Structure 1
């Protein structure tokens, strides 16, 4: 262990040495931020070239962030990453099944091997992240596969926390940017005209802070928290609201999903990071599940942050010079649906 000395800011010590395999991610970026702010020792396994992880260097202090070359297929790389970590956090995930990695791999196969080694190593705790409402029978292969994982990893690593976040709201997120980027599309398809798929977003930071707090709290063991949010929404208001802040016309036109799953298949064929995914589509119209579960935010210590509050920052880049100065007050809020 490492006795925590310091005042609490950078150049201080908190005693959390933590491997974080998928740090380069949108959620990840945030996880390393708090861990680094707190003063924790963060080992970031990376596969993308060094150029892309530079954004993580200034976070954390000198000799507090260590980057290791790692390959998912190669078991040895995971082995050495967790050699000297006592906390392992797994954020490995993707939306597009890539040529050389299947949803199973990114969600269930890999995240197993990882926790498996972590145990061999003797890491005190492992935090595994799987998408919210993930039935072993859910339509989207992604969600189901993720469900498959949360089970397995429990056998490789017992009492391994399993936070299960909803789609995340944050700058650089998809949930909010995706819809806002429908601008290019003249019309914005919305299955069931964006109805009956009530959704509860959660700010990225809230999720991050929550995750971090897990690392430094004994109360969470085998817990399957669910960071959800401060307000639910029918996809209709969300879509329009977005377009509202973006100040771009909103033209909700219903599109039969059966045909739309096909549109997802189309972009899905794209070689360079398909923008929409068959598995995405389903997910988007996959209704958010209700909140009866080990609570996440608040329960883990952070009060959720309403979407409207920070939406202005996430959607600003999509506006035009004409609306750039416009502020949240000028715009209207969307409506929640306790349903």
Structure 2
């Protein structure tokens, strides 16, 4: 262990040495931020070239962030990453099944091997992240596969926390940017005209802070928390609201999903990071599940942050010079649906 000395800011010590395999991610970026702010020792396994992880260097202090070369297929790389970590956090995930990695791999196969080694190593705790409402029978292969994982990893690593976040709201997120980027599309398809798929977003930071707090709290063991949010929404208001802040016309036109799953298939064929995914589509119209579960935010210590509050920052880049100065007050809020 490492006795925590310091005042609490950078150049201080908190005693959390933590491997974080998928740090380069949108959620990840945030996880390393708090861990680094707190003063924790963060080992970031990376596969993308050094150029892309530079954004993580200034976070954390000198000799507090260590970057290791790692390959998912190669078991040895995971082995050495967790050699000297006592906390392992797994954020490995993707939306597009890539040529050389299947949803199973990114969600269930890999995240197993990882926790498996972590145990061999003797890491005190492992945090595994799987998408919210993930039935072993859910339509989207992604969600189901993720469900498959949360089970397995429990056998490789017992009492391994399993936070299960909803789609995340944050700058650089998809949930909010995706819809806002429908601008290019003249019309914005919305299955069931964006109805009956009530959704509860959660700010990225809230998720991050929550995750971090897990690392430094004994109360969470085998817990399957669910960071959800401060307000639910029918996809209709969300879509329009977005377009509202973006100040771009909103033209909700219903599109039969059966045909739309096909549109997802189309972009899905794209070689360079398909923008929409068959598995995405389903997910988007996959209704958010209700909140009866080990609570996440608040329960883990952070009060959720309403979407409207920070939406202005996430959607600003999509506006035009004409609306750039416009502020949240000028715009209207969307409506929640306790349903």
CA distance in 1, matches of 2:66, 2:213: 21
* 1:51 CA drift (Å): 0.0
Q: CA deviation at 1:216?
A: 0.0
- Distance in 1 between residues matched to 2:104 and 2:23, nearest whole Å: 19
Matches within 5 A, 1:73-112: 73-112=73-112
Specify the SS of the correspondent of 2:4. coil
Q: State the 1:308 CA deviation.
A: 0.0
Q: After superposition, what is the alpha-carbon deviation per residue over 1:18-53, rounded to whole angstroms, capped at 9, x for unaligned? A: 000000000000000000000000000000000000
CA–CA separation in structure 1 for the residues paired with 2:91 and 2:40: 18
Q: What corresponds to 2:45 in structure 1? A: 45
Measured against aligned partners, the alpha-carbon deviations of 1:69-123 in whole angstroms (never above 9, x if no partner) come to 0000000000000000000000000000000000000000000000000000000
CA distance, structure 1, for counterparts of residue 184 and residue 211 of structure 2: 35
For 2:284 and 2:58, locate their aligned partners in 1 and report how far apart those are by CA, in whole Å.
Answer: 34
Give SS of 2:127's match: strand
**Correspondence for 1:151:** 151
SS of the counterpart of 1:44?
Answer: strand
Secondary structure class of the residue paired with 2:79: helix
CA RMSD, aligned part only? 0.0
Shift of 1:330: 0.0
Unaligned runs of 5+ in 2: none
Instruction: Give the Cα–Cα distance (whole angstroms) in 1 for the partners of residues 151 and 13 of structure 2.
Output: 34
Q: Deviations over 1:281-315 (max 9, x none)?
A: 00000000000000000000000000000000000
Q: Distance in 1 between matches of 2:123 and 2:272?
A: 37
**1-structure distance, mates of 2:83, 2:2:** 16
1:159-208 deviation digits (Å, cap 9, x = unpaired): 00000000000000000000000000000000000000000000000000
Q: Distance in 1 between matches of 2:275 and 2:138?
A: 22
Tell me, what secondary structure is at the counterpart of 1:206? Answer: helix
| Cα separation, 1, equivalents of 2:132 and 2:243 | 25
Following the alignment from structure 1 to structure 2, what is the Cα–Cα distance between the partners of residues 286 and 104?
20
Aligned pair count reads: 339
Cα separation, 2, equivalents of 1:333 and 1:31: 29
CA distance in structure 1 between the aligned counterparts of 2:171 and 2:178, rounded to whole angstroms = 11
Whole-angstrom distance in 1 between the partners of 2:257 and 2:2:
53
- CA distance in 1 between counterparts of 2:326 and 2:277 reads 33
SS at match of 1:115: helix
| Pair 1:183 & 2:183 matched | yes
Matched, 1:334 2:331: no
Shift of 1:5: 0.0
Shift of 1:270: 0.0
* Distance in 2 (alpha carbons) for counterparts of 1:67 and 1:198: 40
CA distance in 2, matches of 1:139, 1:276: 16
